[PDB]
Design a protein around this ligand. Structure first.
Ligand SMILES: [Ca+2]
Ligand SMILES: [Ca+2]
Ligand SMILES: [Ca+2]
Ligand SMILES: [Ca+2]
Ligand SMILES: [Zn+2]
Length: 316
């Protein structure tokens, strides 16, 4: 809608207070005009028709329980917008400031979130396995990053290309988390996962095997489940990215870490300039080596570490 740009206040899923960019026209809407062609959040009202209703509030204050997922989907979309623009000089997910839209309160007890080709969708969780998934900034940035992949490399959501797709979403999810720098880690979804159990996570990049995911190519899954294991074999690439950033010795292979920022520069370049819809793990290593080479030179530590990292996950 057309309206006056305002700033509201409320708290998130985790009970934290934050300010949000709203739009005033009789009601206050969760529409942020300060980033690109807008960030828009909607109420799916526990149903599954999308996107639902543009979120409207009478007084611009968002402290109801019902408000919380909305507040966070809105806010972390903006943080995710800010990462791509400031860090990668990318304007929204399509690179031309496309409107970002999210729907929350999707279905009943929906233990998931996703990108559906046009927008982000977040369930509320069943309150046991999950709380409203928008509470995790790594979850939000994972979702939007799927959007980024779909407009760039277009990695098909199956087999190795699919695991690459997922891994990219986990890698940038994580980088954005470190970027907002609120308790960041190399784990996935911990803020909104299993409310009753501290310390766990949906997935781990540092040690994917923690949750039954492979950290070596020889342990790769090749059944037909989970689209040929896009959420399973992603661990092999996640581990690799973890290693490039952080370093370590994995199955006897030592990797010199080069930190988060260069990891992000190297994978963003691979994603946008080298990867394609059918790239496999092998092509990804080549893409990453070329990227690192592009960025730091053929004889750099960066190229070397990239190689070490894929070597360690058994990817040639
Ligand atoms: Ca209100
Ligand atoms: Ca965290
Ligand atoms: Ca995390
Ligand atoms: Ca938990
Ligand atoms: Zn995903």
């Amino acid at each position: 809608i057309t309206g006056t740009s305002t700033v509201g206040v409320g708290r998130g899923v985790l009970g934290d207070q934050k300010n949000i960019n709203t739009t005033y026209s009789t009601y206050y809407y969760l529409q942020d005009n300060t980033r690109g062609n807008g960030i828009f959040t909607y109420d799916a009202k526990y149903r599954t028709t999308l996107p639902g209703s543009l979120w409207a509030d009478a007084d611009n204050q968002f402290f109801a329980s019902y408000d919380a997922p909305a507040v966070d989907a809105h806010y972390y979309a903006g943080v995710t917008y800010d990462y791509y623009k400031n860090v990668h000089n990318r304007l929204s997910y399509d690179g031309n400031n496309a409107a970002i839209r999210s729907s929350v309160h999707y279905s009943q007890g929906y233990n998931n979130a996703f990108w559906n080709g046009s927008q982000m969708v977040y369930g509320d969780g069943d309150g046991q396995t999950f709380i409203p998934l928008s509470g995790g900034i790594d979850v939000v940035a994972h979702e939007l990053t799927h959007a980024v992949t779909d407009y760039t490399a277009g990695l098909i959501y199956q087999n190795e290309s699919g695991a690459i797709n997922e891994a990219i979403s986990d890698i940038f999810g994580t980088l954005v988390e470190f970027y907002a720098n609120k308790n960041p880690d190399w784990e996935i979804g911990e803020d909104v996962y299993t409310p009753g159990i501290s310390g766990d996570s949906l997935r781990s990049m540092s040690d994917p095997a923690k949750y039954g995911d492979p950290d070596h190519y020889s342990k790769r899954y090749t059944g037909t489940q989970d689209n040929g294991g896009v959420h399973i074999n992603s661990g092999i690439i996640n581990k690799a990215a973890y290693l490039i950033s952080q370093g370590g010795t994995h199955y006897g292979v030592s990797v010199v870490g080069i930190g988060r920022d260069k990891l992000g520069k190297i994978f963003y370049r691979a994603l946008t300039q080298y990867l394609t819809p059918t790239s496999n793990f092998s092509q990804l290593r080549a893409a990453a080596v070329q990227s690192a080479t592009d960025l730091y030179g053929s004889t750099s530590q960066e190229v070397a570490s990239v190689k070490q990292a894929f070597d360690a996950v058994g990817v040639k």
